[PDB]
Write a protein that binds this ligand. Structure first.
Ligand SMILES: CCCCCCCC/C=C/CCCCCCCC(=O)SCCNC(=O)CCNC(=O)[C@H](O)C(C)(C)COP(=O)(O)OP(=O)(O)OC[C@H]1O[C@@H](n2cnc3c(N)ncnc32)[C@H](O)[C@@H]1OP(=O)(O)O
Ligand SMILES: CCCCCCCC/C=C\CCCCCCCC(=O)SCCNC(=O)CCNC(=O)[C@H](O)C(C)(C)COP(=O)(O)OP(=O)(O)OC[C@H]1O[C@@H](n2cnc3c(N)ncnc32)[C@H](O)[C@@H]1OP(=O)(O)O
Lengths: 408, 408
């Protein structure tokens, strides 16, 4: 059925990481991580005498931080007040008069030019006018598309209900506040309260997400930054770009895994415990995923739920009755254009090919294991080609940005 | 009392097809193939030719035609003369002039075998030519194999013929031969048959033993043989030994896990498949082991079966069970003197503290994780203490060899 429910709980990681063999693999994994840090620390301290621990990268990357705090505050206050009060005025006075669609067409036009103007251009103009550095710029573009999705969902959940006619009004402001911080993008007034907020648990989960952030940063500074200096000096057409595309693969895997674990698990469980959200199904077991059609297991639940429910369903509605291939390629086109936009205005670079070649690589990987081929040779081949293929297109994107798009 | 077989399929066959652990295993293999591929094509571009040329391997094996003939002499000796002595003792029992005079002479002649032929023959031929430490390993391994199998083949049948009419059954040579190749150290005629030998399985297991041996050699040479040259040259002052113990960690646990997998799983299963042995109970889940006094889980069962069943049980019979733990200080001592024999003759170095400090470290790690503390903090601290603990004392052992035997 179409909707959202609270069956799954507590996380898919927490479920496994107390099963004896997998728990002890996880404690060995943590033991290997902390010994990797202590090795790198005290073997480059005793050898050089510095204990450098360079805080150069993040100090530049976050750069103008008070301007992103200020524009996040006015963007939050906008998305909290003007969609709420505009929809409140609408629903209350719908069919008292205006038998033609004139009232709705005018009002929904005012809502659109709000969303495209204020919430589309306001973040994009303040981020490009001051020429924001990419990490602080990323936060503004990330939170922009978040608030655009929440504003769309809040008017998409309540607009079919009022027009099918008594006339169900807008929710309480005390529950709309809750939704704008809730671990989801689909609007509900139904969120089951777990018994209590564990203050020691959210202190531990915030220690975990800041621990994972500083670990990622430390590995990035120590292994990916010297690569970024030597692709910086002689960038153009070197055949020793091959040297570092065969040297960034293992750090690339560890950054992928710790960024996933930090943001999809530690962050969302900390916030979900403070709010007592209850669902906590924030990701599926992606690694077991085999193909796109029916049996896709997305690594990010909340984005796929929004994308399917509010793009696809309404695309298959208007387009045609049996061109389901035309509707799935239209969801790929909507995904491609918002991703290419997001990464392009984030990295100050138009290069549209990244997402569509990711989906061609996903077609290849899915194809080689979806012909009923369980055989571990094909699964090992899929994993090595996935890690190598992602590292190739990532450093080719970084090269094309840094060389041929820097020089004229 | 007595060990009888029931279990099957080691532990890794059953748990590496539980779907999450199966895909963790394929990620691990995909990272291993990328690691050696990437570091090969990095030094093809940095140095010139392939940097792996199998130099130290030829030094390690060296005297291989010597070890093939002495293996044939060991094998034919232990196949014939323990069996022939035991069959001569068998038939004429309880017909002697003086009841014990027969077994006094005969058990003398059997010890003369144990101490002279298997006790001095393999250790004389290894110390004679001063064999290189890896073919010398094969000789002392196969020696103490045949000494344990010869002790068990006598200890299983001698108490049967003694206690009293057909009171003395002694087995065929055709099943003694099968026992001299059997995945065990306790003599039985009690062995099942699997329906067939799978030729595709043993071909896969032998290719996997070969590939894991090759891989362990490649990792050993590149990541710690430059460091072996540094702890040889300037061993004394703390700089190189602190530098080495903090860099011996990740390669040390990698070769430990791969050599465990290659020997305890793949090699023993290849032989257990060719012989259709059925009981693949070759290792318990060490990673879940708790404490010594009871419920101790050993990482190999075969040596634990021999040690418990043929030294602890016999020391219960020598000293009354009120002093049981005070007596089994001598089964700790039996394991100690056989390992210190094995390591000292294998490495040309008498340093007795290794095994007993490993057992005090195991006791300290059991005090850390047991009492049912069970907090992931203590379990992670145990794993970092085990990995760094094996790294620090392996390097202190190799230092005291390369330093205080070569120099003074
Ligand atoms: C851990 C990272 C790994 C990365 C490694 C790279 C490898 C390559 C992978 C590429 C990742 C790109 C990386 C970007 C990073 C950006 C950062 C972010 O966080 S942004 C997140 C963007 N996330 C996506 O883009 C999701 C991936 N793909 C998608 O966008 C969608 O999930 C999509 C469109 C590909 C899924 O396809 P459907 O919605 O289009 O289409 P359908 O399933 O195929 O067709 C409808 C049929 O499916 C059934 N169906 C679908 N879902 C169902 C459900 N839940 N229950 C029942 N039936 C269902 C329906 O019943 C219908 O079949 P009937 O006609 O009824 O028989
Ligand atoms: C992956 C390696 C990582 C290593 C990391 C470092 C840590 C150190 C560890 C290890 C490194 C060694 C490296 C050597 C390498 C060379 C090559 C090889 O393959 S050799 C390997 C084995 N090496 C040994 O040394 C033998 C195992 N070690 C032991 O210490 C023994 O297991 C030992 C001494 C603990 C055996 O037990 P007890 O002699 O303490 O016996 P009691 O305390 O009397 O337990 C018996 C009581 O429990 C009951 N029980 C019942 N079922 C039992 C059972 N299945 N097992 C044991 N006890 C049982 C009995 O009924 C009895 O109870 P009632 O006192 O009479 O009331």
């Amino acid at each position: 059925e179409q909707g959202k429910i609270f069956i799954a709980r507590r996380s898919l990681l927490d479920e496994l990481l107390e099963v004896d063999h997998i728990r002890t693999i996880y404690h060995m994994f943590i033991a290997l991580l902390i010994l990797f840090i202590l090795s790198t620390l005290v073997v480059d301290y005793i050898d050089e005498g510095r204990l450098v621990l360079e805080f150069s990268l993040l100090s530049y990357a976050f750069g103008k931080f008070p301007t992103v705090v200020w524009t996040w505050w006015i963007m939050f206050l906008s998305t909290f007040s003007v969609p709420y009060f505009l929809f409140q005025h609408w629903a209350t006075g719908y069919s008292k008069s205006s038998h033609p669609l004139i009232r709705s067409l005018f009002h929904g036009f005012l809502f659109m030019i709000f969303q495209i103007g204020v919430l589309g251009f306001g973040p994009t103009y303040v981020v490009l006018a001051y020429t924001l550095p990419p990490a602080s710029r990323f936060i503004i573009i990330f939170e922009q598309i978040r608030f655009v999705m929440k504003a769309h969902s809040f008017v998409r959940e309540n607009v079919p209900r009022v027009l099918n006619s008594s006339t169900v009004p807008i929710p309480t402001v005390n529950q709309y506040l809750y939704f704008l911080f809730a671990p989801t993008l689909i609007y509900r007034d139904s969120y089951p309260r777990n018994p209590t907020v564990r203050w020691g648990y959210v202190a531990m989960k915030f220690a975990q997400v800041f621990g994972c952030f500083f670990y990622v940063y430390y590995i990035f500074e120590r292994l990916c930054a010297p690569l970024f200096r030597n692709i910086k000096q002689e960038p153009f057409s070197a055949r020793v770009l091959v040297l570092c595309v065969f040297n960034s693969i293992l750090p690339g895997v560890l950054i992928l895994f710790l960024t996933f674990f930090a943001f999809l698990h530690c962050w969302l469980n900390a916030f979900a415990e403070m709010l007592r959200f209850g669902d906590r199904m924030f990701y599926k077991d992606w690694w077991n995923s085999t193909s796109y059609s029916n049996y896709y297991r997305t690594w990010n639940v909340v984005v796929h739920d929004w994308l399917y429910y509010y793009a696809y369903k309404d695309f298959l509605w208007f387009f045609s009755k049996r061109f389901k291939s035309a509707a799935m390629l239209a969801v790929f086109a909507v995904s491609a254009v918002v991703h290419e936009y997001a990464l392009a205005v984030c990295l100050s670079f138009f290069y549209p090919v990244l997402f569509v070649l990711f989906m061609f690589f996903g077609m290849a990987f899915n194809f080689i294991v979806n012909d009923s081929r369980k055989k571990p040779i094909w699964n090992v081949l899929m994993w090595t080609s996935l890690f190598l293929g992602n590292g190739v297109l990532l450093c080719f994107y970084s090269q094309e940005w840094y060389a041929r798009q820097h020089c004229p």
